C-alpha cells in the first residue's frame, strides 16, 4: 500500500542519514584551527557606476575581467567598462521586471530574464551597430530567476516552477528538464568543468544535477528556510549557500554533508548573494542590512565588511582574475572594490 | 591625457548617459501599479475595460492608461505558481497595489480575506497602500435580494451587525444589500486597521466589472498617496 511505500522512503532517508553520520569523522573547524587567520582585510571602492534608474537585481562579470553586465528594474541592461567607468551598450528590454542576467564566456552574447517567464538572449557583436535579440526561450511556467551560459549554444535556466532547464539556443527547445524540487528555485552555479550544476530552491534544499544524464545526484538539506544564493568553490568539489535564516553554509559533494556554517548573532537578515575569491579562502556574501560581509571560508569569522550602499545588496560577483569585486544594490549603484 | 579612441569612447558613453536622462524624465513621471486577485474576481474584465476605454506561458502583462495627462502602469501576473512570497519583493516601490475581491461568492470570501491579510502584513509591502475593489456588486445584489443563498451561515457575526452611520447608498436600493456589502467592506477594513501603523492606508471602493469610473478612482487614490508621501519627505509631518 501507499503506507508501505512511505515507510520504505522513510527507511531509505534514515539509511542516508546514518551513512552521513558515520562518514563525518572530524569537523572543518578542528582541522583548520591551526592555520593562521586571514586577518583584517580592507577593500576600498575604486569605482562607482552611475546610470541605472531603478534598483539592481543582477550582475555578471565578463570573462575578460574588464566588462560587466548589469540588470535593473527600469528595463535596462548596461554593459560597463570597469576600468574607465564608460558605458559600452545600453540594452532596453521588452519587460521591465528582470531579475537575472548573464554574460557569455566568449563575450558575444548576454542573457536576461525575469517575471516574463522568458530568457531573452542578446547578440552583442553584430554586423550592424545595434544589439539585437538573438532568441527568446519560452517554456518555463514560473519566473526565470537565474541563467548561466555553458557556451554560445547552451544555456541553463532556473525558474520559480520547481524546475531547471537546459536549452539549445539554435533551436529554442529544452534538451533536458531537471525536476525534483518542491519550491521556487532561485540560484544556479555551474561547475568549472561545466558537467554539473547546483541549484537552491525555497524547499530549503540544494541539488547537484548532471547536465548530460539529466538526473539529480545528491540532495542537501541544511538550511531552515528558502535558499537565495549558491556558488561553486573554485575546486569544483564544494559549494556555499545563502538563505533567509541569515546563515551561509558550505557543503561538499564528495562527503555529501555540510562542513561549516557562517552566522553571527548580531546579523539577522537574510543573504542575497554569495561568491568566492580565486583561492576560495574568502566567502563574500551580500546581506539585507545594506552591507556585504567577507567570511574566511576555512574558519567562519568575518575578515571584513563592505559598507558603501544605502539599500540592500542584491548582486555580487568576483572577477575571474580575482582582481576586484562588484556589488550592486537597490540604490541603483554598482561599486567595484579592491 | 588619453588617446583618440578613448575620447570617442567617452563621447559614446556621454551620449548613452543623455539617453538615460531622457528615460529618467519619463520614468519618474509614470506611476506603477500591481493588480492582484483571485480567478473569480473580475480583474481580467477590469484590465480589459481599462485598456479598451484608454504568449502562451507569459508571466506578466502590462497596461497603459492615462487620466488627466498622468501616466499609469498596471501589471498583473499571469503564469505564476500558487506561492507569492518571493516575486512580491520586486514591487516594493510601486505606488499602490490594486486588490480585487469578489463580493458575490461567499464560499471563497474567507480565502480572499486571508490573502488580503497576507498582502497587508508582508514585510516588503509596508508603506505600500492598497486600493480595494470590492468587485461584482451587481451579482451581490441578486445574491442578497433572492434569499436562496444566505450569508449569516458562512459568517456567524452578520446577525450582530448594524449598518454604519457613514453608509451612503446613493442610487436607491434595498437596505439589505447595503448592509451586506458594508459588512464585507468592514471585514476587509478590520484586517486593514488592525496593524496599519499609519505608514499605509487602504482605500475601498464598490466597483463592478464593467464600470467607466475605475481609472478615476485609481487616479484619486494615487493622488492621495503621493500627497501623503510628499507630506512625509517635505518635513510637514
Amino acid at each position, epitope marked *: 500500500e501507499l503506507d508501505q511505500l512511505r515507510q520504505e522512503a522513510e527507511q531509505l532517508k534514515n539509511q542516508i542519514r546514518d551513512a552521513r553520520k558515520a562518514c563525518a569523522d572530524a569537523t572543518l573547524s578542528q582541522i583548520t584551527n591551526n592555520i593562521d587567520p586571514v586577518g583584517r582585510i580592507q577593500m576600498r571602492t575604486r569605482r562607482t557606476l552611475r546610470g541605472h534608474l531603478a534598483k539592481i537585481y543582477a550582475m555578471h562579470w565578463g570573462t575578460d575581467s574588464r566588462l560587466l553586465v548589469s540588470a535593473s528594474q527600469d528595463g535596462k541592461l548596461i554593459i560597463w567598462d570597469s576600468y574607465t567607468t564608460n558605458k*559600452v551598450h545600453a540594452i532596453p528590454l521588452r519587460s521591465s521586471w528582470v531579475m537575472t542576467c548573464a554574460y557569455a564566456p566568449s563575450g558575444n552574447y548576454v542573457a536576461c530574464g525575469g517575471l516574463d517567464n522568458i530568457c531573452s538572449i542578446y547578440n552583442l557583436k553584430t*554586423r*550592424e*551597430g545595434n544589439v539585437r535579440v538573438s532568441r527568446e526561450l519560452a517554456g518555463h511556467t514560473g519566473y526565470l530567476s537565474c541563467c548561466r551560459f555553458l557556451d554560445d549554444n547552451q544555456i541553463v535556466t532556473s525558474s520559480g516552477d520547481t524546475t531547471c532547464a537546459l536549452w539549445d539556443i539554435e533551436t529554442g527547445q529544452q534538451t533536458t528538464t531537471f525536476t525534483g524540487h518542491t519550491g521556487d528555485v532561485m540560484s544556479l552555479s555551474l561547475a568549472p568543468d561545466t558537467r554539473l550544476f547546483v541549484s537552491g530552491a525555497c524547499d530549503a534544499s540544494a541539488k547537484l544535477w548532471d547536465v548530460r544524464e539529466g538526473m539529480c545526484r545528491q540532495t542537501f538539506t541544511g538550511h531552515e528556510s528558502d535558499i537565495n544564493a549558491i556558488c561553486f568553490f573554485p575546486n569544483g568539489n564544494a559549494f556555499a549557500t545563502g538563505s533567509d535564516d541569515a546563515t551561509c553554509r558550505l557543503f561538499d559533494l564528495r562527503a555529501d554533508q555540510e562542513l561549516m556554517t557562517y552566522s553571527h548573532d548580531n546579523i539577522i537578515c537574510g543573504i542575497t548573494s554569495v561568491s568566492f575569491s580565486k583561492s576560495g579562502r574568502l566567502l563574500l556574501a551580500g546581506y539585507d542590512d545594506f552591507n556585504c560581509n567577507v567570511w574566511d571560508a576555512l574558519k567562519a569569522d568575518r575578515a571584513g565588511v563592505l559598507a558603501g550602499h544605502d539599500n540592500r545588496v542584491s548582486c555580487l560577483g568576483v572577477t575571474d582574475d580575482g582582481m576586484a569585486v562588484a556589488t550592486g544594490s537597490w540604490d541603483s549603484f554598482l561599486k567595484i572594490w579592491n | 591625457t588619453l*588617446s*583618440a579612441e578613448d575620447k570617442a569612447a567617452v563621447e*559614446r558613453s556621454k551620449m548613452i548617459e543623455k539617453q538615460l536622462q531622457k528615460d529618467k524624465q519619463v520614468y519618474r513621471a509614470t506611476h506603477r501599479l500591481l493588480l492582484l486577485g483571485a480567478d473569480n474576481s473580475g480583474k481580467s474584465t477590469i484590465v480589459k475595460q481599462m485598456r479598451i476605454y484608454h504568449v502562451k506561458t507569459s508571466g506578466i502583462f502590462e497596461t497603459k492608461f492615462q487620466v488627466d495627462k498622468v501616466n499609469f502602469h498596471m501589471f498583473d501576473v499571469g503564469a505564476q505558481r500558487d506561492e507569492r512570497r518571493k516575486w512580491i519583493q520586486c514591487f516594493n516601490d510601486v505606488t499602490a497595489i490594486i486588490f480585487v475581491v469578489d463580493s458575490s461568492d461567499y464560499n471563497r470570501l474567507q480565502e480572499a480575506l486571508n490573502d488580503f491579510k497576507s498582502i497587508w502584513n508582508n514585510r516588503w509591502l509596508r508603506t505600500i497602500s492598497v486600493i480595494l475593489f470590492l468587485n461584482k456588486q451587481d451579482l451581490l445584489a441578486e445574491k442578497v435580494l433572492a434569499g436562496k443563498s444566505k450569508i449569516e451561515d458562512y459568517f456567524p457575526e452578520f446577525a450582530r451587525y448594524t449598518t454604519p452611520e457613514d453608509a451612503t447608498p446613493e442610487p436607491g436600493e434595498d437596505p439589505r444589500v447595503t448592509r451586506a456589502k458594508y459588512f464585507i467592506r468592514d471585514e476587509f477594513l478590520r484586517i486593514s486597521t488592525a496593524s496599519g501603523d499609519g505608514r499605509h492606508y487602504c482605500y475601498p471602493h464598490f466597483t463592478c466589472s464593467v464600470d467607466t469610473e475605475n481609472a478615476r478612482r485609481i487616479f484619486n487614490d494615487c493622488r492621495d498617496i503621493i500627497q501623503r508621501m510628499h507630506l512625509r519627505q517635505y518635513e510637514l509631518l
Partner: single-chain antibody
Framework: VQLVESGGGLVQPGGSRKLSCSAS????????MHWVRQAPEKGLEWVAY????????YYADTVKGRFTISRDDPKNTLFLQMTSLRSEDTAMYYC??????????????WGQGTTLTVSAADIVMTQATSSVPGESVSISCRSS???????????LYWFLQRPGQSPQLLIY???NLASGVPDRFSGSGSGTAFTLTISRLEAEDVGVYYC?????????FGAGTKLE
C-alpha cells in the same frame, strides 16, 4: 551593410561640389564616419571625420578651412562640402564606417568610392618596400613616433586594396583579425616597427597593403606595398 556614395565629376578650379554618402543596412546613428581619398595613382590620404552625435569634427591641415563635413542621421546620409577646389584635390573619395568602444573594430567597412577630377609635426608612416603563390610573404612598415599608448593599445591598422575595389580591413590595433579575414593573415609589431605576415598566400590576396595610425589626428597612411 552598404555605403553607396555619389556626387563626383569634372570641376573647374575655384569651384565647389558636395559629396553624399547614403548608408543602408546598419545603425548609422551610432557610427563615426570618415572621408578618405587617394590620388589616381598614389596612396590613401585622410580628409575628415565626424563623430556620432556630431559633437566632434576633425579636418586635415590641407583642407582645414575649405571643406565641411556633415551628417543627417534621420536620413542616413553623410556629406562633404568642398569649396575652392584646386588641382591637387583630385582623387576618389571614400566613405568609411567607424565605431569606438572597448573592443570595437574601427574602419571596418568602406564605401565603393566616388571620383572627382579638377581640371588644370605629425606621425609619418614609411613602407620602404613598394613591390614584392603558395609562399609566406611578410610586409613591414615603420613610424616616427611610438604607437604604443599607456593603455597597452598599439593603434596600428592594416588595409588591403584589391586591384578593382575599395580597401578592406584586415588587422586593427596591430594584432586583431577583422571579421571575415581568414586566419592566414597575422599582425605583429614592437611599438615603432611593425609587420604583416600572410602564411599560405592565395591568388585572392594580391593588391596594395596600407598601414595606418589612429594614435592622434591627423591620421597618416603610408605609401603602401604592392604584391604581384
Amino acid at each position: 551593410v552598404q555605403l553607396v556614395e555619389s556626387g563626383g565629376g569634372l570641376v573647374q578650379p575655384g569651384g565647389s561640389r558636395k559629396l553624399s554618402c547614403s548608408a543602408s543596412g546598419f545603425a548609422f546613428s551610432s557610427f563615426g564616419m570618415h572621408w578618405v581619398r587617394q590620388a589616381p595613382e598614389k596612396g590613401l590620404e585622410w580628409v575628415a571625420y565626424i563623430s556620432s552625435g556630431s559633437g566632434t569634427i576633425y579636418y586635415a591641415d590641407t583642407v582645414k578651412g575649405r571643406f565641411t563635413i556633415s551628417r543627417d542621421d534621420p536620413k542616413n546620409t553623410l556629406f562633404l562640402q568642398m569649396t575652392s577646389l584646386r588641382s591637387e584635390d583630385t582623387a576618389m573619395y571614400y566613405c568609411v564606417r567607424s565605431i569606438y568602444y572597448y573592443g570595437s573594430s574601427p574602419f571596418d567597412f568602406w564605401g565603393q568610392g566616388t571620383t572627382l577630377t579638377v581640371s588644370a609635426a605629425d606621425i609619418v608612416m614609411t613602407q620602404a618596400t613598394s613591390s614584392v603563390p603558395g609562399e609566406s610573404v611578410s610586409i613591414s612598415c615603420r613610424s616616427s613616433k611610438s604607437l604604443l599608448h599607456s593603455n597597452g593599445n598599439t593603434y596600428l591598422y592594416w588595409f588591403l586594396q584589391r586591384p578593382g575595389q575599395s580597401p578592406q580591413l584586415l588587422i586593427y590595433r596591430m594584432s586583431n583579425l577583422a571579421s571575415g579575414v581568414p586566419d592566414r593573415f597575422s599582425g605583429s609589431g614592437s611599438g615603432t616597427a611593425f609587420t604583416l605576415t600572410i602564411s599560405r598566400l592565395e591568388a585572392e590576396d594580391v593588391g596594395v597593403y596600407y598601414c595606418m595610425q589612429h594614435l592622434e589626428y591627423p591620421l597618416t597612411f603610408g605609401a603602401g606595398t604592392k604584391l604581384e
